[PDB]
């Protein structure tokens, strides 16, 4: 979608010692951000929501099963939307966010494994403390990463 356009005439050093006249039409275009927000980011936020709410039932075996299943779901969804992800040779803020989300889901799988070990060894108070600590840090980790990426890739003044 064309945000703005502008036609204007300049001079350019021609092949000889003189200059040629140039007429440049610049169109400021942008993507349909609604499509990416509703197709890529909303299902993703739901997958993180599942991986964050599995820390409520604290059965520690059911939690582990759902954590592994949700990591598999995240992989499958990532490749489902990989069709529109451009196969550019360099990183992108969408790629960076997918990367961070996958690392955090794998980390919650690891924490579920450790919590299951704690539940089996006989330490459940420590397991509950780790559980509530995950509940409090996970949303702030995601918010901090989003703020950091916004500051890095969209601002210079602030």
Question: Is residue 111 within 8 Å of 83, Cβ to Cβ?
Answer: no
CA 142 to mean position of chain CA atoms: 9
Beta bridge partners of 2: 29
Q: Does 19 bind a copy of itself (CB under 8 A)?
A: no
Structure letter (DSSP) for residue 81: G
Q: Does 91 bind a copy of itself (CB under 8 A)?
A: yes
* Least Cβ distance, residue 127 to a copy of itself (angstroms): 12
Q: What is the CA radius of gyration of the chain?
A: 24
Binding footprint of a copy of itself, residue count (CB under 8 A): 58
Using alpha carbons only, give the angle 144, 90, 51 rounded to the nearest 5 degrees. 40
Q: Does 71 bind a copy of itself (CB under 8 A)?
A: yes
Question: Among residues 76 and 137, whose Cβ is nearest to a copy of itself?
Answer: 76
Q: Does 123 bind a copy of itself (CB under 8 A)?
A: no
Distance separating alpha carbons of residues 153 and 110, to the nearest angstrom: 31
Q: Which stretch binds a copy of itself (CB under 8 A): 3-11, 28-36, 139-147, 148-156?
A: 28-36
Return the closest-CA partner of residue 53 out of 120, 117, 112, 114.
Answer: 112
- In degrees and rounded to multiples of 5, residue 16 shows phi and psi of -95, -170
Q: Which stretch binds a copy of itself (CB under 8 A): 5-13, 49-57, 133-141, 143-151?
A: 49-57
Interface positions with a copy of itself (CB under 8 A): 15-16, 31-32, 34-35, 38-39, 42-43, 46-47, 49-50, 53-54, 56-57, 59, 61-62, 64-66, 68-73, 75-80, 82-84, 87-91, 95-96, 99, 102-103, 106-107, 109-110, 113-114, 116-117, 120
């Amino acid at each position: 979608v064309v945000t703005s356009y502008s036609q204007e005439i300049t001079e350019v050093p021609f092949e000889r010692g003189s200059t040629n006249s140039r007429f440049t039409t610049t169109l400021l275009v942008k993507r349909n951000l609604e499509y990416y927000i509703l197709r890529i980011f909303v299902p993703l936020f739901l997958i993180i929501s599942v991986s964050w709410v599995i820390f409520f039932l604290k059965d520690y075996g059911r939690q582990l099963e759902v954590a592994s299943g949700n990591l598999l779901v995240f992989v499958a969804f990532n490749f489902t939307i990989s069709g529109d992800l451009p196969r550019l040779g360099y990183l992108t803020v969408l790629d960076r966010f997918m990367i961070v989300s996958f690392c955090l889901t794998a980390i919650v799988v690891l924490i579920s494994v450790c919590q299951k070990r704690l539940g089996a060894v006989g330490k459940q108070a420590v397991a509950a403390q780790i559980d509530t600590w995950v509940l409090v840090i996970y949303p702030l980790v995601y918010s901090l990463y989003i703020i950091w990426v916004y500051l890095r890739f969209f601002t210079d003044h602030i």
